[PDB]
Each structure stands twice: as structure tokens, then as C-alpha cells.
Design a protein around this ligand. Structure first.
Ligand SMILES: CCOC(=O)c1c(OC)nc2n(c1=O)CCC[C@H]2N(C(=O)Nc1ccccc1C(C)C)[C@@H](C)c1ccccc1
Ligand SMILES: CCOC(=O)c1c(OC)nc2n(c1=O)CCC[C@H]2N(C(=O)Nc1ccccc1C(C)C)[C@@H](C)c1ccccc1
Ligand SMILES: CCOC(=O)c1c(OC)nc2n(c1=O)CCC[C@H]2N(C(=O)Nc1ccccc1C(C)C)[C@@H](C)c1ccccc1
Ligand SMILES: CCOC(=O)c1c(OC)nc2n(c1=O)CCC[C@H]2N(C(=O)Nc1ccccc1C(C)C)[C@@H](C)c1ccccc1
Ligand SMILES: C[C@](N)(Cc1c[nH]c2ccccc12)C(=O)O
Ligand SMILES: C[C@](N)(Cc1c[nH]c2ccccc12)C(=O)O
Ligand SMILES: C[C@](N)(Cc1c[nH]c2ccccc12)C(=O)O
Ligand SMILES: C[C@](N)(Cc1c[nH]c2ccccc12)C(=O)O
Lengths: 314, 312, 319, 315
């Protein structure tokens, strides 16, 4: 095979038509503007390729066979590696001064008229709240959030008739807080009762299903109450073999959120720089990470009974 | 204008034909392999765009009007910023394990744009483009000609090389006297060797015949007069006329460091999947010349107006 | 000299006292937390070293000798290189999970009680709106913004008796806009003509606002402007004539100043995210005027032309 | 607690004594030189902190309880993340021109980093001297990883017998290839594929020559033992099987650390030459096993009804 024919460089390297050169006088920096956007769109296509493949593994049921956890986590890690390079790619646009941009700015019609289809498809496919047919599919089809929520709802250890994680956790937090109240009641004392009455209210709020449902309606929550429990199960028992790679998956999901927001931040700054001057899908994963529960209150697991913690399924 | 029509996304986003999917069974990682190479080639086209424009400014004589120094230095800096991102772009190929590569390896070269870039900088139908890059004036040759016209070299005027030679000679004689006076010791017996080595190196700078010999052996690239112009820019870099030209010599060295770092990363990735060439060596060499700042010939503002007066 | 003695490694490498190990049981990740903060503080000390030296060059008058422009621009570039590494340094804290942080979180007393003195000194020295004595000096002494403002007020070409840049610019913008109004009113009464009069009446109001000194003074009181009206003109002079030899390196300095603002804000953004991640969840731009002047839609053909036979200042440097 | 007291900023921020300012006239860039080296040394201390903790987990036997695999892999990943930042930290020294360095070069006389040497020794690269003697004598990360690879499940000849099954499959697969090639008509493609086969066969069959591996280990060309080599290759081919997913990430981390240490060494040599005018790869065996052209259909198949070790963890 010929290198250029394999990469279809006759299409890729023949798609740089300068609008300044077309509509009048050529402006040198417009070529940088065109290539940078083409480079972003090539990487958006790759991020969609990796995202749809991971979505397929969940949707078609392959994620149930736990041999595919390495491939899901690996591909989610690749998405964040690509996103890290896209955040670094802003440094190239920084080399184009605002004064030079205003030279070719006239040939770019209204700026509030350009919108990336692939970026919108990517946001929709993750779960952010002819070309229109593709957009209608991205909004209708199962998002990476919905597919991760369904999988979190099936987390081992949640079943009330088995391990009953939420029941044990609630009882342990209640019994642990009673010991704390006793220890405190036995200026420093008057201040520690306020620090306790605040920690108690926060910890017990986790067991209020009606408050979670209210927050889901207000847009402050995305995951269902059962998916929230499955994620918290993976968090506290992350060292247990069955939850080690699933813990890396929850981490990757949060990383992709941090990087998409960091990219969005960089983008807004570049837009405000050239034209003159919430989005976290996995907020629940960030929120569960910020729960002050002592490791000694986490329900202890018996290896003689709870074989699920160290036995994998296909 | 429509965004996708402006970027010609109908060509760009419809050029990913997987050879595994075509010749049999689709291998997922092959899409990453295709996009990464297409991304490199888009940036190679940009580096050639910036390089040819800078080359044009020198070749057509616009570089003589010093208003274009900001544009040359700015564009050379941009090339290094793109090269920095291309070195980082190797991390994406690293996400493809060697074992996954062997799955699509059965269905699988030389980059024309990379070769055109190397040729255009001065590294020692598609073939017509290659023949032009080898024949046309390189960025090194164009920079050499411009360095040959550096103000202050003229023997009838500032005579930089004459003043510098006398100052280095008189300064080294003081050093020999200062060392031979020190008491016979281990420090004195060692500093005579450190002096006889520094003297041989410093005085070699004024041997034009040795420079010409080294140019033939490939050890030097710039002419003896271009070498003097570059060293003039180095020592008088704080003088207004040489501030932006100093940044240009720095950018040229940066591009060499980054091309070599890219080449290093490339070789490692090739050896990972399938189991010197510094154009501006003279700019690196002149940066490593141990000359005390008090030996640099001083310049009088009443006589040497060239140091603070620009030309168009 | 001995390597460790030169770097004072007996002080540097003997300053890692884990509070978890001290007050109870050792938590491994607390060492990463301590070293990362010590690394940030070493770079903050370096940024203050470079910043104070640049501030000294302006304040002591050395910036008047234009041989020091390469050294000012070089050091401002270094500050942004250090800041870029500090933004990348957040990736190391990302390696510490929130769950691991909660293990040593108890030994760190109230978080709303820790404050970096050096970060505050750095913000004050740039111009962001015994240890307290150092802070009092940073707030009282001349900021990098005030020192850059004074230098911008002396930009060649502003003098009304000489080049008179603001006068020429105002006349050219006024005469150019009148031709635009005539060109638009000549076009046949259509949807394109009725829409271009709105695009013109908006561009005219924006362009002519640049010559309203009373509006600039009003915006300076509201905090929307930082530079004086004359410093604003000096910066715009450097912008339009940036290719002229005398303004090439000063243009790079205005660019560095804006870069430092973008990077300080990008660092602040990264910091807030890391704080919200571990403890549960244009104002700070000193050089806003430099960003604003970059966004002024003036056609290059309206920029007052310069005669080399008369305007020798554009290509002749001063000491 | 006070922020500066917690970080001991009275030691950290009061350790910058410029030798140019001390021995005569202050050279501004010397402060950058001192802080950059102090920043490297702070990160070297952190890399040693993470490395010793991982080494302890192996040496004291905690690595046998597989609940600690997340903590080993996580910490090895952290070392690479710090090393990535140290490679980026060279860009700061690049802001100091060679000409500016020669201004303070006279006050610097030869120096050697003890922590860098301790780090190289602790990974397994082939009063302060007491610390160096301990790093050379104590078990390296390579030796501790080798011992753990020697106990990889599936190697046991009485059980799964990975090496036996693999050898038979490679032998039978190569015979099919020889037959398939010799059948092809005498052509330029046929005359070239016999050379490509005789080279691939010699390479693949060399993997089962224990005497050649022992000889290469003595010549320094190999680091891991023959059994550790088999355990690593077992983790490679069965990386998708639950028990080998996290151990595969560990072998990847170990190779990453080698790639990054080499990239750091490259950057260092360039910066040294700029201011003053497979050998070091500890895990060469992990890189070598990654470059073994074996078709996935020749990998011995595993039965879940019999081979419960692939999906059952141990404590
Ligand atoms: C949040 C997803 O962003 C979009 O869908 C989007 C968009 O799509 C191509 N184009 C733009 N905006 C957008 O919100 C804001 C006005 C500016 C415009 N541009 C961008 O930002 N390009 C841009 C810049 C940096 C990084 C990435 C992009 C694109 C790919 C989003 C270019 C097209 C432009 C700049 C200046 C004048 C005229 C056009
Ligand atoms: C010094 C200029 O390099 C070349 O001209 C060149 C080249 O051009 C496209 N392609 C290759 N080599 C080369 O020397 C060496 C063998 C490997 C091959 N590949 C590369 O390296 N791609 C590559 C990798 C990383 C970064 C950049 C490239 C290309 C763009 C040079 C891809 C095509 C490949 C990989 C594996 C199997 C088959 C093909
Ligand atoms: C805008 C300037 O920032 C400060 O002056 C400042 C500060 O100074 C040391 N320390 C903190 N905050 C601050 O606003 C917010 C609460 C958290 C706290 N921490 C930080 O952010 N460290 C931090 C993190 C990343 C990067 C840099 C820093 C410091 C050097 C600012 C550490 C001390 C911490 C974390 C968690 C619990 C307890 C303490
Ligand atoms: C392979 C492990 O390297 C060393 O142990 C080592 C060393 O230790 C501190 N110092 C040096 N060399 C070394 O081989 C080579 C000569 C140069 C010297 N320097 C360095 O490289 N610093 C350096 C530079 C960049 C990154 C890291 C370092 C140190 C921390 C290794 C500084 C001390 C220096 C520069 C110029 C003149 C005098 C001294
Ligand atoms: C067999 C299973 N993979 C079980 C499962 C569901 N959610 C999980 C989270 C972590 C670990 C396992 C699970 C499945 O039902 O998909
Ligand atoms: C007028 C001029 N630009 C002079 C020139 C040549 N080489 C230089 C190096 C540095 C500074 C100036 C020059 C020219 O002849 O091109
Ligand atoms: C001699 C001078 N450096 C002139 C000056 C002031 N501001 C400037 C801006 C750009 C260029 C020059 C200046 C001085 O008075 O400081
Ligand atoms: C119980 C065990 N961790 C078994 C073991 C050894 N090496 C391994 C490699 C991959 C997976 C498991 C192992 C041990 O003996 O340490």
C-alpha cells in the first residue's frame, strides 16, 4: 500500500481553502486557523469512535462478561489522553495575535453561526443535558451516563437479602455517631457539638431517598438512588479484587468530566480573546468522593461468606 | 459560510478507510493509527506553510527591511510551538499496546511532507516536489547569507573580528602570567592544562583555514563570515539592532532541539511497534565559547550609530 | 563545593514532617501533599525573584535605556514558562484520590485557615486589586501594572506637538466612518441595506467611544479599567506600529503581560477545581486594557501612515 | 496548624544562598539554577517515597494478598506522572541562555545527586555512603518483581502447564506455515516468504531455549529469570482474564517508568551538553515479550469449568 493512499491524504491534504485568498487578499495566519480546527475535528472523530465502542460494550451486554473491563477502562483512559492533547493544542492558537485575526476576521461571516456537529454529538453521547438526523440519534440513543447507571444498579453487594450494603452502612453510621456524641459529651466542648451536629446532618442525608429524588428533578443529581449506592460500594471496597478495575472506570469517568470542563474553559477564553469579551455528567461520582466517613465504620466483609468480592463473572 | 464547508469536513472527516475492515475483520485500534497520522500530516503542512513563508521573506529580500523581523521570529516561534505539540502527540500512540497493533499489523511507508520539511530547513509528481525542495534555497542558506551582512563586521568600520582577536590575545596573555605566578602546587599544575586547552579552543575561532576544512568534512555548515555575524549578534544581543535577531538565532536552535527530540521519540515508537543532524550546529557551537564579558569590545554611541539605528 | 551544601539540602530535604505520622497513624499520600506544596512554594519564590527584578528595572529607571528590553521581555517569558509548569503540576495532585485524602484530612485542622503568603505577595506585586510587614510592603510599593502604566505614558509618537497619534487616529476614524455611511446610504433600499445600517451604527458607537476620555475615567472608577487614558494610548501606539523596530520588543512585552494574566487565571481555575475536588463543592485580569485594545475593529488602511524622512523615532533607539 | 509551619517553609524558603552573591557579585540567573535543582530533589524524594513503599509491599509479602494490587499499580503510575513533570521541568532551564550561565559558571568549580543514584539503584539499574551501600545491597524493584512473576498462576506443569501447551501450539502452527509456504508456486513472493518464515521461526522457537536465556542473562542482555519471563508472558496473553487485568497494568507501569527514565536521561544529557559545551532499561524483558509475533489463535484456550484460577483471587 502507498502511505498517502492508506491515509487518504488526497482528501485530507487538499481541504485547506483560505477564505481570504478566495474572497480577496490572502492572510497568512488564516492557514493556521483552518489546520487547527481540522486537527480538533480529527480528534473529535476519534473521541466519538472510542466513546461509541465503549457505549456498545455496555448496551449490547458485553460489560457483564468482566473480561472486557480492561478494554473499557483502557479506552476511557485513551479518551482522556486525547482530551489532554486537545487542551495543549490551544497553545498553537495563542501564537496568532488578536491583531492578526482581525485581518481575516471579515471573511468569516457571523461568528455566532459556526457550531461543531461532532462536539455536540460528543456532549450528547456522554450525557451532557442530514446532520440533524445524526443529532436526533445522539439525543435519543442511550448516553454513556445512562449505560453506566444501569451497570451501577447491578453492583454486587447491594441486594438486601444478601450483603445489604446500604442497610449495614446506615446502621454503622448511626451506631458510630452515637459513640461520637458520647465521646464529645464526656469552649472546646461547645464548639465540637456544632462540628458534630453538622457532620451528622450531612452523613444521614445520604440515606434520604426523597431528597435524592428532589435533587434529580432540580438537575443537581444524574444517577438513580440505586446507581448511587453501587458507585459508593465500588468506592469503599475498591481494594477488593472485583472492584479494582471498576474503581478505575469511575475514576476515568470523573477524569473525562474534569478534562471536558478544562477544555471548555480554554475554549471560552480563546473565544473571548479573539472576538472580544454544571456541565459535569458524573457529578454524583464527584459528590460520593466527598463523604467524610471513617474507614473503621465501613461494613466489614467475611471472605468465608462473601465470595463475590474475589470471584469474577462472565 | 457553513463551518463544515469552510473546513472542507466532507474531505477531512470522510478519509478514514480502515484496511482491516476492508480486507476482512475490523480492528478497533486501526482508527487511532489512521487519525494520529492524519493529525501529524496536517501539522507538517502547517510547519511547511510557516517555513516557506519565512524562506520567502529572506529569499525575496524583504528581510532587509527590518520591520519584518517580528514576523520572522514570531513564525519561527510558532513552528517550535507546533513541534512541541507533535512531541506530545506520541503519548496517543502509546495508548495502543504492541499486542493490539499485531492484530492489524498483517493488513499494513515514508512521509513526503516530513522529507520536504527536512530538505527545506537544510538537513543534509510527488518526486517533482522533492526535487524542488533539494534544489531550492534552504532556511540555513538563506540565514547564512543574511548573517554575512551583519553590521559591525566591516574591517574599515567597527572591525569586530580584529578588536575581538586582539582582546582575546591580550586577555589570554594576562591569564598565562596570572597562572605562572601562582605557587607550584596541585592547583597550579592542573590550571596550566585547563589554560592550554581553553587557549587552543579560543584561538581556533580565528583560524579561517580550519573552519573551511571543517566545512568540507561536514562538521560546519555556516560560512566563516556568517559565523562572525552570528557571534556579533550573540555578544551585542542587548543592543537594540540585535535584540530581535538574537531571538531568531535562539528560535533556529530551538527548532533543531525539537526536531531532534521528535526524531528521538519517533525512533522509540518505531522500535516499540516493530520490535549531528543539527542544521544550526554553528549556533550551538558559538553559544559554547568561554569568553569573559570584560573582553568583549566596547561600543561608543557617539560613533557606532548602527547599534541603535534600524534600516529599511 | 559539595552539591548538597550548595543547594542547602540539609534544610530542603529535612522539612517533610507528616502530620498524620506525628498526631497518630501515618498516611502515605500525605507525603505527596507536602512535597507538591513545597514545590509550588519554591516556584512562587522564583516568580517573585523574576517579578521584583523586572519591577526594579522599571522603578529605578533602567527601562529608559532600551538595551534592557531584551532582559525585561526574557524574564517575563520565564515567568510564563514557570506558570505553565505550575498548571501542569496539578496532574500530580490528581494522582491522589479524594478517598485517600479523607484519611489524612482530619490532621489538617480547618482548611479555611491556610493561605499562601508568597501567592498573595505575587498577586499584590503584579497589581491584582513579620510576615504582615512583607504583605504591607507588597500592597504599598509600586505594582508591575503601575510601573508599566508610567512607561506606557512616555511612548514615542503620542506628543500632540509631534506625531500626535491620537489626533491623527481620531481624524482618520471619523473621516473613514463618514465614507462608510455614504457608501451604505448609496446602496439600494433592501434587506441587506436595512441591516448594514445597524451593523454600522454599532461599529461607529464602539470606535468613537475610544476617544471619550470622560467614559474611560468613569470605567476606571467602576473598576472596568486599570490603565490611565494616556497609558491606553501608548499601548495602542505599540499595537498598531508593532512592526516598527522601536516597538517590536515592547510589543512582545505587552504580549508577555497578557500571557501572564491568562496563565494566572488558568492556574486559579485549576486551583479552585482541585480545592472543590478535595474538600467537596476578567476580574483578576490586571492587564484587561491590553486584552481590550487587541479587540478594536479598525481597518489597517485607516492607521495613520508614517514618513521615514520625518519620523526617525520609529527606527532610532534611545539610552 | 499554620500553613508555613506545616510545610516547614522556614527551612524550604530559607535555603537559597547564591554562590555568586556570596563570593562577589550577584548573578540573577543563579537563583533559577538553585530553585530548579531544589524542585528536582523534592520530586526525587517523592519518587523514592513511592518506590520504597511499593518495594516494601513486595518484600514483606503483602503483594500476595491481591487486595494491594490497586495500591501498587496506582503508586507506580504516580511515579511516571512525577517523571513526566520532571521531563517538562527542563523547559525552565532552557529559559537560562548559555551566555548567562557563563556569568555564574566561575563560582561553580563535579556534582552528583545522591537521591538520583539511590533511585537508579532501588529500581535495579546495573553517612551518605551508608545510604548508598544499603540501596546497592537491598532488594531492587526488579528482583522483587522477578520473584512475584515466578509465582504467576498457570505456569505449574502439573496444572495449566502454559509453557508446554504454548510450545506445542507454536510448533504445530509453524509446521502449518511451512506447508502453506512450500505449496505456493515458485515466485518472487514465495522466495521472499521462506526467508521471512525462517527468521520468524528461529525467533519464536528461541523463546523455549532455556540454556540461551541463561547465557544471555550472564552477558547482561537479560534481567529476569526464565520462570519470571514465563509468568510475564502469561500475564500478557491472558491480560483480559480478571486475575491478570491489574497485574498487566503493573507490567505496563514498569515499562512506562523505563521509557520515562530514558527520556529524562536523554533530556539531561542534552542540557548538560548545552550548558557545559536498551542498556539502562531494567525491564528490557517486559519490552521484549511485547515484541513476540504470535497469532491469537495459537494462544492456549482456557476452560472456565476447570481453570478457576483465572477468575478467582487469593489473599
Ligand atoms: C462549545 C462547542 O463550540 C462550538 O460548537 C462552537 C464553534 O464550533 C465550531 N465555533 C465557534 N464557537 C462555538 O461555540 C463560539 C464562537 C467562535 C467559533 N469558533 C470556535 O470557537 N472555534 C474553536 C476554537 C478553539 C478550539 C475549538 C474550536 C471549535 C472546534 C469548537 C470558530 C469557528 C471561530 C472563531 C472566531 C471567529 C469565527 C469562528
Ligand atoms: C523520519 C521520517 O519518517 C518516515 O518518513 C517514516 C514513515 O513515514 C510515514 N513511516 C514509518 N517510518 C518512517 O521512517 C519508519 C517505519 C514505521 C513507519 N510509520 C511511522 O513511523 N509513522 C509515524 C509514527 C509516529 C510519528 C510519526 C509517524 C510518521 C508520520 C513519520 C508508520 C507509517 C507505520 C508504523 C508501523 C507499521 C507500519 C507503518
Ligand atoms: C488563591 C491562593 O490560595 C491560597 O492562598 C490558599 C491556600 O494557601 C496555601 N490553601 C488553601 N486554599 C487557598 O485558597 C483554599 C483551601 C485549601 C488550601 N490548600 C490549597 O489550596 N493548596 C494548594 C493546592 C493546589 C495548588 C496550590 C495550593 C496552594 C499552594 C495555594 C491546601 C493548603 C489544603 C487543601 C486541603 C485541605 C487543607 C489544606
Ligand atoms: C545522572 C545523574 O546526574 C548526576 O548525578 C549529576 C549531577 O548531579 C546533581 N550534576 C551534574 N551532572 C550529573 O551527572 C553532570 C554535570 C552537570 C551537573 N548538573 C546537572 O546535571 N544538574 C541537573 C540538570 C538538569 C536536571 C537535573 C540535574 C541534576 C538534579 C541531576 C548541575 C549540578 C551543574 C550544571 C552545570 C555546571 C555545574 C553543575
Ligand atoms: C456480572 C456484572 N458485571 C456484575 C456487575 C454489575 N455492576 C457491577 C459493578 C462492579 C462489579 C461488578 C458489577 C454485571 O451484571 O454486569
Ligand atoms: C539591512 C539588513 N537587515 C542588515 C542586516 C544583515 N544581517 C543582519 C543581522 C542583524 C541585524 C541586521 C542585519 C540587511 O542587509 O538585511
Ligand atoms: C526612552 C524610553 N524607553 C521611551 C519609551 C517610553 N515608553 C515606551 C514604549 C515603547 C518604546 C519606547 C518607550 C523611556 O522614556 O523609557
Ligand atoms: C497469591 C499471589 N498473588 C499469586 C501471584 C504471584 N504472581 C502473580 C502474578 C499475577 C497474578 C497473581 C500472581 C502470590 O503468590 O503472590
Amino acid at each position: 500500500l502507498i502511505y498517502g493512499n492508506y491515509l487518504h491524504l488526497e482528501k485530507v491534504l487538499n481541504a485547506q481553502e483560505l477564505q481570504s485568498e478566495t474572497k480577496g487578499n490572502k492572510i497568512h495566519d488564516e492557514h493556521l486557523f483552518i489546520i487547527t480546527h481540522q486537527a480538533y475535528e480529527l480528534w473529535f472523530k476519534q473521541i466519538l469512535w472510542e466513546l461509541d465502542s465503549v457505549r456498545e460494550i455496555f448496551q449490547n451486554g458485553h460489560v457483564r462478561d468482566e473480561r472486557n473491563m480492561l478494554k473499557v477502562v483502557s479506552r476511557m483512559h485513551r479518551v482522556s489522553v486525547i482530551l489532554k492533547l486537545l487542551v495543549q493544542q490551544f497553545s498553537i492558537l495563542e501564537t496568532m495575535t488578536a491583531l492578526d485575526f482581525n485581518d481575516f476576521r471579515e471573511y468569516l461571516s457571523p461568528a455566532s453561526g459556526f457550531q461543531s456537529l461532532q462536539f455536540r454529538l460528543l456532549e450528547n453521547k456522554i450525557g451532557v443535558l442530514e446532520e440533524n438526523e445524526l443529532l436526533l440519534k445522539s439525543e435519543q440513543e442511550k448516553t454513556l451516563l445512562e449505560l453506566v447507571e444501569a451497570w451501577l444498579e447491578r453492583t454486587p453487594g447491594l441486594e438486601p437479602h444478601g450483603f445489604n450494603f446500604w442497610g449495614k452502612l446506615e446502621k454503622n453510621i448511626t451506631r458510630g455517631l452515637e459513640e461520637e456524641f458520647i465521646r464529645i459529651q464526656a469552649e472546646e466542648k461547645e464548639e465540637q457539638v456544632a462540628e458534630f451536629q453538622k457532620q451528622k446532618e450531612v452523613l444521614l442525608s445520604l440515606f434520604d431517598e426523597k431528597r435524592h429524588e428532589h435533587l434529580l428533578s432540580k438537575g443537581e443529581r444524574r444517577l438513580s438512588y440505586r446507581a448511587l449506592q453501587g458507585a459508593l460500594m465500588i468506592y469503599f471496597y475498591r481494594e477488593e479484587p472485583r472492584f479494582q478495575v471498576p474503581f478505575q472506570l469511575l475514576t476515568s469517568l470523573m477524569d473525562i468530566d474534569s478534562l471536558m470542563t478544562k477544555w471548555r474553559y480554554n475554549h471560552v477564553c480563546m473565544v473571548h480573546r479573539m472576538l472580544g469579551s454544571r456541565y459535569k455528567v458524573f457529578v454524583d461520582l464527584f459528590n460520593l468522593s466527598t463523604y467524610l466517613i471513617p474507614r473503621h465504620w465501613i461494613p466489614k466483609m467475611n471472605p468465608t461468606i462473601h465470595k463475590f468480592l474475589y470471584t469474577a463473572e462472565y
